[PDB]
Amino acid sequence: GAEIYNKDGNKLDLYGKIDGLHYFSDDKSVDGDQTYMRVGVKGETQINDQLTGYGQWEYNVQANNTESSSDQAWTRLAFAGLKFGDAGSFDYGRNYGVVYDVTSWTDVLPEFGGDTYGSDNFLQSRANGVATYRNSDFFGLVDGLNFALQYQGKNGSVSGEGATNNGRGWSKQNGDGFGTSLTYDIWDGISAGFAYSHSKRTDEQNSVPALGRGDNAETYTGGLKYDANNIYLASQYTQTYNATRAGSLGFANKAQNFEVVAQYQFDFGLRPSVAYLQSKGKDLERGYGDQDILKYVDVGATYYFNKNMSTYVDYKINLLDDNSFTRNAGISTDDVVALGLVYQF
Amino acid sequence: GAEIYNKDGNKLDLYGKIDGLHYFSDDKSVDGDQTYMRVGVKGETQINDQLTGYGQWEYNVQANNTESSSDQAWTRLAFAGLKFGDAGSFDYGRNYGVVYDVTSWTDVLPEFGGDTYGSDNFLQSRANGVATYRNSDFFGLVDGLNFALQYQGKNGSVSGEGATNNGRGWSKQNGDGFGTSLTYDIISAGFAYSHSKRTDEQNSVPALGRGDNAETYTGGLKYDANNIYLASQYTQTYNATRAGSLGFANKAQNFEVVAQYQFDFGLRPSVAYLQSKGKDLERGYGDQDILKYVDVGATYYFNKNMSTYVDYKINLLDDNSFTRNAGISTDDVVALGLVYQF
Amino acid sequence: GAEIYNKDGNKLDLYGKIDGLHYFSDDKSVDGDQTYMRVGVKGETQINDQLTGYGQWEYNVQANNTESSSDQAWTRLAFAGLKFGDAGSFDYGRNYGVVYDVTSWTDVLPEFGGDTYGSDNFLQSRANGVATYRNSDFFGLVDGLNFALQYQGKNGSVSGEGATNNGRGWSKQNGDGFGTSLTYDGISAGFAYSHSKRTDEQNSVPALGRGDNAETYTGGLKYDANNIYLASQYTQTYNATRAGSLGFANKAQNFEVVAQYQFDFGLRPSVAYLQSKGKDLERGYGDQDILKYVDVGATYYFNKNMSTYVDYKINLLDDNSFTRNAGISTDDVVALGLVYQF
Amino acid sequence: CSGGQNTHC
């Protein structure tokens, strides 16, 4: 980003982007203008030679609606923490789950992708009140092995027996949970990762929605990645238990998510990309049985003028078949085309 | 603005203001504190010797209400674009309409003014999803002639047949539309034209305003020399001017004139007159005055960063059935302000 | 704060903090994550050798809720003003009341404390449309004596006879009011007095609190030397202290005292006691305790940019009909924090 | 809804 201050061992970095984005689709819920921008600040202070403090805030503003609209801006990241030489780091606040450490390898598409999981969905994406301890090189015992733990406090309902101060609907509630991740670089380019999470489920999550009954939400993830010679390859496979949203109908008892992405970077700045994503649910209630929650193929490309300006086109080919489950759960089954013009600072 | 970063051919400009503002009026809907602030950023990157990219964001935050209030902040501008040297420029996002290119010459009042049209009102002001191509010197032909092309996508209802992702009420919906503008320095003269499709909800929900297309023709004049500022513009609209909350006016004629003088020690008195007459309204309203008032005020500039002003609006509208039903204010307003600009 | 711009006699200061905060309590309305952050800007321009203009904006963003939640950000401070050398200063906008000039001496606790009053509560805390004139060293008569006047406009209901443009519920409405403060000197003494009119809505909607005016008398003491901080303030209010959600207390007597000691290596343990007793409450409530608790905690400062703290609030209130009806919490709270300040 | 410094509730 743009470093706007560096004095007395304290540095401030201001970063963000403005995205002029348009969607072309037959689905009236996604077609139209999608302009927005991001703004954020990253700080870091040098407490001493072997202790360092830092903090980061990221904020999202929607600019595709009228000036009288409501709920057009929200916070994505907000956390403060400490770095202890090379013994690790700790931070608390709104931050990414440890499952993202593996699942982000395939989240490199121009506009789409990374939608087999939602935000505020246990420890798979950005969450609230996550205490994350991260260790690099595994205490120095083995080089190149990253490692992390996580703990998340309960986020209950707006009111009732299981309420907390920050209430929310059953789709984003959770109990006390923890997660771990482990990524290693076998050699140059090739890397492997593995993640695991386990959280408690609130009472409303077991009574209000029609689909999904269980006590614990579990997630197993394993990914692979190749990044060298202007070639990017990545894939990740995930199996969840009572942790994947089946649209607005509730949660899927068993789900298997698979994402694969292939990208190449040209000399003059063009970066074509091809990807495939799917998400299959099993053992759903109400006689739904086994249904496809997500299935589409993504083709697109990106052009980089420089490190501050770029434009892209993204085509999502939806392979889902319309049926009772998709209509009831409100899952879109239409193709979408996106055009973007981004300025980054 | 304050240039806070300039490295690697990329510069960031931070700009904004804090306005301590108070209104003195008999209309309880406008009387009271009106304190607010603006904050924004302007960027520009040098891609090469003849190509340039840029982006601009503007944010408005209201600070005249309590800490538990809702919907006190909103975005005014957000767009990104490219400049092809002297061959023109293109940008997309939330930006001004091409009609503003001519109607902004009279939007120089201290506090009031520029209210014959509203925001998110077709292509007359700030709008959503507008793709604008602007060309200076009109390619390689006559110098001093500015030309602009614009296209806006559909912004439909919240839900239903004509819905889009960003739904809104009928007062701010629109169909596919385009607009042109043309200004020349000879003293300056300008002309603007816009044409947009009207949504189905706009033709059924409100009581006033029936038509397929929204039309706008604008012509303007400007004099800016020897510490004297004179400007005026005349606009004729078809199914494009809001008749308060009752809907749209079938025909409307807007006229604004402003005169200003800048003193050597910092005082800038201003006098202006604004009017807007609607015609062929339904419900038996006939011809009604939508807006009519005289503005007298002055501004004192301590320097480029600090200023204060007093604005007096003398409302000449007459109270009747149409004004009360449409919710149009007919009371005088006095504004006192103390602005710090950074 | 971080000075990010200083050119042409104009300077801009950017400040804020990110607070990773967690609450441990048996009260489900306060237990859980409490992460938030603050951001703001301070400006100042040199008009001439003896005149100066300035402006300050402070904005609060909550980050402990989901991205689809509502009303998570609000503005705390926004004002612009002028400084006439040593003859005083004047500013208008959303600013602190003059009662805060004395009641902030005891508002130094890590997380809790300073809650015998509320924001947007007459002139005791941050308010809307306050015009403040502040004079340092009392013109030239004496040295070391600070002095201030304030005036606030009416902030009426959302709609009705007493409405203004910025309407609000009866808990935050007020009429015309004014206030004065007077601080003199490591021992310091302070005195503040405010007087505001009460709106008609405040006298009819809530069950508790009837009167024409809201008055506040505050006396303060402070000791700040040799790494020792002792401060206490006693306040007597008249129809100006909220009795939870039931209305206003006819008479209240607030008393808060704080003792802190700063250690050499950065530890700052603190002990405080707060109480607030209401009198002459209607509905047969009689005399009740609105707030009563003991605060014990400590703060560690790694440097001027990073710090951490633990705060333990021991609630001494007894659960009864008044506390349950007014929604006043009677549970202990433990807070853990990790703050980065820039 | 609390005294100016650390907002409560």
Q: Rounding to the nearest 10 degrees, give the CA dihedral for residues A84, A85, A86, A88.
A: 10
Q: Both tokens of residue C332?
A: 């202990």
Q: Does A156 touch chain C (CB under 8 A)?
A: yes
Q: Both tokens of residue C342?
A: 């820039």
Q: Rounding to the nearest 10 degrees, give the CA dihedral for residues A184, A188, A189, A192.
A: -20
Q: Does A69 touch chain B (CB under 8 A)?
A: yes
Q: Does C311 touch chain D (CB under 8 A)?
A: no
Residue A173: list chain C partners with CB under 8 A.
Answer: none
What gap in Å lies between CA B172 and CA B248, rounded to an integer?
11
Q: Rounding to the nearest 10 degrees, give the CA dihedral for residues A123, A198, A93, C25.
A: 140
Phi, psi of A102 (to 5 degrees): -100, -40
Residue B68: list chain D partners with CB under 8 A.
Answer: 1
Identify the residue among A4, A21, A310, A341 best suited for mutation to test binding to B, counting B beta carbons within 10 A and taking the highest: A341
Report strand pairing: B177-185 vs B188-197: antiparallel
Neighbours of C103 (CB within 10 A): 28
What does the DSSP assignment read for B191-209? Answer: EEEEEEEPPTGGGTSSSB-
**Window D:1-9, CB contacts with B under 8 Å:** 1, 7
Q: Does C63 touch chain A (CB under 8 A)?
A: yes
SS3 A103: helix
What gap in Å lies between CA B147 and CA B82, rounded to an integer?
16
What gap in Å lies between CA A72 and CA A335, rounded to an integer?
25
DSSP A157: B
Q: What residues contact A327, with CB distance under 8 A and at least 6 apart?
A: none
Helices (H), B41-171: 100-103
Report strand pairing: A216-228 vs A231-245: antiparallel
Question: Is B324 exposed, middle or buried (CB count within 10 Å of its CB: 0-12, 13-18, 19+)?
Answer: exposed
Q: What residues contact A212, with CB distance under 8 A and at least 6 apart?
A: A205, A206, A242, A246, A250, A251, A252, A253, A285
Is C227 annotated in some ligand binding site?
Answer: no
Residue D1: list chain B partners with CB under 8 A.
Answer: 67-68
DSSP C113: -
SS3 B324: helix
- Say which amino acid occupies C316: L
The region that residue C251 occupies, defined by phi over 0 for left and psi between -120 and 50 for alpha, beta otherwise, is beta
A68 vs B70: CB contact, 8 Å cut-off? Answer: no
What gap in Å lies between CA B204 and CA C79, rounded to an integer?
45
- Say which amino acid occupies C102: V
Which residue in the set C9, C12, C92 is minimally distant from B2, CB to CB? C12
Residues forming beta bridges with residue C23, ordered by sequence position: C32, C335
What gap in Å lies between CA B342 and CA B306, rounded to an integer?
9
Which residue in the set D1, D3, D9 is minimally distant from C114, CB to CB? D3
**Window A:29-48, CB contacts with C under 8 Å:** 41, 43, 45, 47
Q: Both tokens of residue B49?
A: 């010797």
Q: How was this structure determined?
A: cryo-EM
Total domains, chain C: 1
Whether the CB-CB separation of A152 and A175 falls below 8 Å is answered with no
Q: Both tokens of residue B332?
A: 């005088």
Residues forming beta bridges with residue C278, ordered by sequence position: C252, C288
Q: If you measure CA to CA, which chain C residue comes closest to B37?
A: C78
Nearest to A230 by CA among A265, A255, A269: A265
* Helix/strand/coil (H/E/C) assignment for every residue in B37-64: EEEEEEEEEECCCCCEEEEEEEEEEECC
Q: What residues contact A187, with CB distance under 8 A and at least 6 apart?
A: none
DSSP C157: B
Is C305 annotated in some ligand binding site?
Answer: no
Which chains are within 8 Å of C by 3+ CB pairs? A, B, D
What gap in Å lies between CA B237 and CA B219, rounded to an integer?
12
Instruction: Output C327-330 pairs: Cβ under 8 A, ≥24 positions apart.
Output: C327/C244, C327/C245, C328/C244, C328/C290, C328/C291, C329/C27, C329/C29, C329/C30
D7 vs C119: CB contact, 8 Å cut-off? Answer: yes
DSSP B246: S
What gap in Å lies between CA C246 and CA A104, rounded to an integer?
51
Residues forming beta bridges with residue A157, ordered by sequence position: A163
* Helix/strand/coil (H/E/C) assignment for every residue in A193-233: EEEEEEEECCCHHHCCCCECCCCEEEEEEEEEEEEECCEEE
Residue C73: list chain A partners with CB under 8 A.
Answer: 73
Q: Both tokens of residue A91?
A: 């931070």
* Residue B14 CA to its chain's centroid (Å): 22
Helices (H), C158-295: none
What gap in Å lies between CA A37 and CA C70, rounded to an integer?
19
Whether the CB-CB separation of C150 and C135 falls below 8 Å is answered with no
Whether the CB-CB separation of B313 and B110 falls below 8 Å is answered with no
> Which residue ranges of A make up the annotated binding site for Mg(2+)?
213, 242, 253
Q: Rounding to the nearest 10 degrees, give the CA dihedral for residues B317, B319, B324, B329.
A: 40
Residue B60: list chain A partners with CB under 8 A.
Answer: 67
B67 vs C126: CB contact, 8 Å cut-off? Answer: yes
What gap in Å lies between CA B235 and CA B192, rounded to an integer?
9
- Say which amino acid occupies B110: P
D9 vs C113: CB contact, 8 Å cut-off? Answer: no
Helix or strand run (H / E) with residue A102: helix A100-103
Q: Does C72 touch chain B (CB under 8 A)?
A: no
Report strand pairing: A145-152 vs C177-184: unpaired
Cα angle, residue A142 at apex, residues A136 and A144 outer, rounded to 5°: 50
Helix or strand run (H / E) with residue C245: none
**Distances in whole angstroms, Cα of residue C119 to Cα of each of A235, C29, C312, D3:** 52, 19, 23, 5
Cα four-point dihedral sign A23, A24, A25, A28: positive
Q: If you measure CA to CA, which chain B residue comes closest to D7?
A: B67
Is C210 annotated in some ligand binding site?
Answer: yes
Residue C50: list chain B partners with CB under 8 A.
Answer: none
B114-151 burial: b if 16+ Cβ within 10 Å, else e: bbbbbbbbbbbbbbbbbbbebbeeeeeeeeebbbbbbe
What does the DSSP assignment read for A35-77? Answer: -EEEEEEEEEEE-SSSEEEEEEEEEEEE-SS-TT-S--EEEEE
Q: How far is A36 from chain B (nearest CA, A)?
A: 7
Return the number of CB contacts < 8 Å for B and D: 3
Whether the CB-CB separation of B269 and B298 falls below 8 Å is answered with yes
Which residue in the set C60, C111, C119 is minimally distant from D1, CB to CB? C119
Which residue in the set B18, B28, B66 is minimally distant from C78, CB to CB? B18
Q: Does A200 touch chain B (CB under 8 A)?
A: no
What gap in Å lies between CA B313 and CA B26, rounded to an integer?
12
Q: If you measure CA to CA, which chain A residue comes closest to C337?
A: A92
Q: Does A317 touch chain C (CB under 8 A)?
A: no
SS3 C100: helix
Which residue in the set A35, A73, A308 is minimally distant from B93, CB to CB? A35
Only one residue has tokens 């333990």, namely: C312
Q: What residues contact C139, with CB distance under 8 A and at least 6 apart?
A: C87, C88
Nearest to C170 by CA among C247, C118, C75: C247
Percent of residues in chain A assigned helix, strand, coil, to nearest 5: 5, 60, 35
What gap in Å lies between CA B332 and CA B329, rounded to an integer?
9
Q: What residues contact C292, with CB distance under 8 A and at least 6 apart?
A: C274, C275, C276, C315, C316, C317
A99-111 burial: b if 16+ Cβ within 10 Å, else e: bbbbbbbbbbbbb
A92 vs C20: CB contact, 8 Å cut-off? Answer: yes
What does the DSSP assignment read for A256-304? Answer: EEEEEEEEE--TTSEEEEEEEEEEEEEEETTTTEEEEEEEEEEEEEEEE
Return the number of CB contacts < 8 Å for A and C: 147
> Which residue ranges of A make up the annotated binding site?
213, 242, 253
Cα angle, residue A128 at apex, residues A127 and A133 outer, rounded to 5°: 80
Q: Rounding to the nearest 10 degrees, give the CA dihedral for residues A171, A174, A177, A181.
A: 20
Q: How far is A19 from chain B (nearest CA, A)?
A: 7
In Å, what resolution does this model reach? 2.7
| Structural domain of A194 | 1-345
What gap in Å lies between CA C264 and CA C297, rounded to an integer?
17
Cα angle, residue C274 at apex, residues C255 and C319 outer, rounded to 5°: 120
Whether the CB-CB separation of A175 and A206 falls below 8 Å is answered with no
**Distances in whole angstroms, Cα of residue B164 to Cα of each of B146, B199, C98, C277:** 34, 12, 50, 56
Nearest to B32 by CA among C94, C119, C91, C171: C94
Phi, psi of C171 (to 5 degrees): -70, -20
Residues forming beta bridges with residue C295, ordered by sequence position: C272, C313
The region that residue B9 occupies, defined by phi over 0 for left and psi between -120 and 50 for alpha, beta otherwise, is left
What gap in Å lies between CA B184 and CA A118, rounded to an integer?
53
Q: What residues contact C128, with CB distance under 8 A and at least 6 apart?
A: B33, B35, B63, B64, B65, B66, C94, C120, C152, C155, C166
Q: Both tokens of residue A53?
A: 């403090």
